[PDB]
Write a protein that binds this ligand. Sequence first.
Ligand SMILES: *[C@@H]1O[C@H](CO)[C@@H](O[C@@H]2O[C@H](CO)[C@@H](O[C@@H]3O[C@H](CO[C@H]4O[C@H](CO)[C@@H](O)[C@H](O)[C@@H]4O)[C@@H](O)[C@H](O[C@H]4O[C@H](CO)[C@@H](O)[C@H](O)[C@@H]4O)[C@@H]3O)[C@H](O)[C@H]2NC(C)=O)[C@H](O)[C@H]1NC(C)=O
Ligand SMILES: *[C@@H]1O[C@H](CO)[C@@H](O[C@@H]2O[C@H](CO)[C@@H](O)[C@H](O)[C@H]2NC(C)=O)[C@H](O)[C@H]1NC(C)=O
Length: 428
Amino acid sequence: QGAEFPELCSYTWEAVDTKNNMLYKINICGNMGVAQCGPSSAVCMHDLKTDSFHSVGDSLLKTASRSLLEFNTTVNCKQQNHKIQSSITFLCGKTLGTPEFVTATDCVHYFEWRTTAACKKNIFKANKEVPCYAFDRELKKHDLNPLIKTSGAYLVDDSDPDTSLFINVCRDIEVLRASSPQVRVCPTGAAACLVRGDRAFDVGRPQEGLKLVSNDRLVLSYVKEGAGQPDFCDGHSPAVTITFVCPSERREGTIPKLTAKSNCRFEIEWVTEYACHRDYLESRSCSLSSAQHDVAVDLQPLSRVEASDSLFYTSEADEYTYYLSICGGSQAPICNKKDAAVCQVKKADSTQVKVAGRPQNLTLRYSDGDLTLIYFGGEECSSGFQRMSVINFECNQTAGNNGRGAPVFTGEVDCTYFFTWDTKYACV
Ligand SMILES: *[C@@H]1O[C@H](CO)[C@@H](O[C@@H]2O[C@H](CO)[C@@H](O[C@@H]3O[C@H](CO[C@H]4O[C@H](CO)[C@@H](O)[C@H](O)[C@@H]4O)[C@@H](O)[C@H](O[C@H]4O[C@H](CO)[C@@H](O)[C@H](O)[C@@H]4O)[C@@H]3O)[C@H](O)[C@H]2NC(C)=O)[C@H](O)[C@H]1NC(C)=O
Ligand SMILES: *[C@@H]1O[C@H](CO)[C@@H](O[C@@H]2O[C@H](CO)[C@@H](O)[C@H](O)[C@H]2NC(C)=O)[C@H](O)[C@H]1NC(C)=O
């Protein structure tokens, strides 16, 4: 078909309101198969407190807009004259993403979904992508979206100097836009590719979404149906199973590893903190705590400087100049009212300024030994993607500027601007 976010109708998506112990099941097409919800429920709410189900949005009472889906119901609200409703705002994203619970009134349940399905150009869409997250019994989110590559793949660790095993997470490997002459040899649509020198073989494609087996173990399975197999396996249909493991203790990142290769039925283990609860990895402020993240970080001191130099940071590039105002700091004059944490100014014409990240939209993340600060919600690019900036922090106890260091623009990839920043404040 292709009507109203097609690639999303293939699955039933969950979302949660942790403050109220509510687990939501979302099926934009209205067919999650939950007897307690009703056959046409589009948004079903599982009240875990009373263990009961209530549809809060019906697929047959849908109103669609460019980036908005509203589902009404015939259920009267606690507030007289109002019916229960559910509303999902869509924004362009680079991965399939997840429907994030935003808030709920007594009558309306609001969600926000940043997904490749809501972009203006099918350009960001993967050939095939599946849900890449799962909630545990405590309603904590285990999200692998950050590991999904929109270009290239991951070289898996094994012991075959004739085989090079490449995989992507929750989707096919983009072989067209690949810089590796090796990956550029893989078949399109493949999520797992075996390169036996001057030859590549699709040994797995995405089908089902990520699954949680234990509070610290996530499993993803790629398969292949029908004949036409490589046959080096002797009639065995290729299959790949990846087990993502959340380490009990923080540690440096490790590469996924091949633990089995029983003839076209590869098994990989990947120990990564991305498999842990998301709230253990992220903060919506410039600090991480030992209590919540097992790491103590505070970037607030980077927004302050001696009464001698600029109140903001300047990161020059070939055709643009970037001004960064971090952790509530002050912005450069040129980026006046704009309210941007990161602002891009065209060198050739300084009247062209684009917000590349807003202060109210920040995520400080620490996972697998890397500290990242992300500012999002910037002005939309032609693709519909709101500009965003990612600052890859690096520990350096003797970093210049008395430890504060300074941001260095390292490049742009489709409206996501990257910077590297060595600072003593990134030392864990
Ligand atoms: C889910 O439950 C809700 C809550 O009751 C219902 O929501 C109402 O839905 C109607 C549409 O059926 C809404 O009315 C429509 O609003 C559109 C937007 O209005 C704003 O923006 C325009 C910009 O052009 C302004 O002109 C306008 O003043 C507002 O600022 C309008 O564009 C629509 O206009 C079209 O229809 C009307 C007649 O309905 C024509 O006169 C016009 O020429 C034009 O063709 C329309 O007015 C209404 O606002 C919603 N109420 C809310 C949100 O509280 C849903 O209908 C229900 N779902 C289902 C399936 O029934
Ligand atoms: C992105 O930042 C904006 C503000 O900079 C947040 O959006 C605001 O949300 C409130 C309600 O919470 C609205 O009243 C405002 O109108 C919104 N601002 C505008 C003009 O868009 C948004 O919530 C931030 N994203 C997240 C998830 O933190």
